[PDB]
Amino acid sequence: TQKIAFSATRTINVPLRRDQTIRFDHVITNMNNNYEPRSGKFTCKVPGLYYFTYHASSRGNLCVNLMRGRERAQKVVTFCDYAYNTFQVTTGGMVLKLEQGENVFLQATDKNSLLGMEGANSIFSGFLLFPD
C-alpha cells in the first residue's frame, strides 16, 4: 500500500552555482522516506506515475532544470521566470513515469536568484499518483 509524498523547503542561505543540485533542507512531509533532505533528490523505490511541483521565491532572474535519471541525470524541462528590481514567486510542475532507482531533483543555472526564508519560502514537493 504505497503512500509516498514529500514536501521540503529550502532555508539554506547560500548562493547557488550553475549545475548544482538545489537542496531543500527542511522537511515538512516525507512519507516513505524516498526524499533525501541531505541531497535534495527524490529517489524512486516504487516504480510508477508521480507528480512533482515547486514554488520558488526570488528577487531576480531564476531558471531551474527539472532533472530525471538513475546515475546520470537528464533535464526534462527548464522553467525560467525573470524579475527586475522586485520580488516574485514562480512555479513549475510535471507528471513523470519513474522507474526504480531514478532520481528527480532541481538543478540550478546561471540564473540563480532564489530565496529560502520564513515569509518567502521556496518549496519542492512530489507524490505518487499510481504505482506500476
Binding site: 506515475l49 524541462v77 527586475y84 510542475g93 510535471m94
Partner: protein, 133 residues
C-alpha cells in the same frame, strides 16, 4: 486500475486558433491527451486535477476550458500582463469533475495571447485522476 495522467510541453506547436496546443508529450498514461489538438479526453469518470505553467514575455491570459456533449464550458482565467519583454510564468489549476467523453483544454485570450517560443525554457499542461466516480 485506471491511471490516467499526462504532461505536455510546447516545442513545435501548431499555431492557429485559441486553443493552446502542447505538442510534445512527456507523460500520457492511458493516452488521454491528444498532442495534435491540445485536448484531454476523459475516459474514466471522476475527479481530476489540471494545472498549467506557461511562459510569456508580454501579455497572456489563459483559461482551463471543458466540454460536455460538445458544449463548451468556460471557466476561470489567469493572466500575467507585466508586459516588459522578460520571462514571466502564468499558472492556474483546478479540480474538475468529468463524465466520459468530456474534453479539457487550455485557451488563450485572443487579445492577450503571447506564449514564448524557443529553446530557453518551457510551458507545461498537466492533468491526472484524483479519484473515480
Amino acid at each position: 486500475q485506471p491511471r490516467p495522467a499526462f504532461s505536455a510541453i510546447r516545442r513545435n506547436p501548431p499555431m492557429g486558433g485559441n486553443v493552446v496546443i502542447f505538442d510534445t508529450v512527456i507523460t500520457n498514461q492511458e493516452e488521454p491527451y491528444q498532442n495534435h489538438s491540445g485536448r484531454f479526453v476523459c475516459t474514466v469518470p471522476g475527479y481530476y486535477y489540471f494545472t498549467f505553467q506557461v511562459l510569456s514575455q508580454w501579455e497572456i491570459c489563459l483559461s482551463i476550458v471543458s466540454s460536455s456533449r460538445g458544449q463548451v464550458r468556460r471557466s476561470l482565467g489567469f493572466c500575467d500582463t507585466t508586459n516588459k519583454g522578460l520571462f514571466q510564468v502564468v499558472s492556474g489549476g483546478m479540480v474538475l469533475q468529468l463524465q466520459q467523453g468530456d474534453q479539457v483544454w487550455v485557451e488563450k485570450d485572443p487579445k492577450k495571447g503571447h506564449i514564448y517560443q524557443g529553446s530557453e525554457a518551457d510551458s507545461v499542461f498537466s492533468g491526472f485522476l484524483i479519484f473515480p466516480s
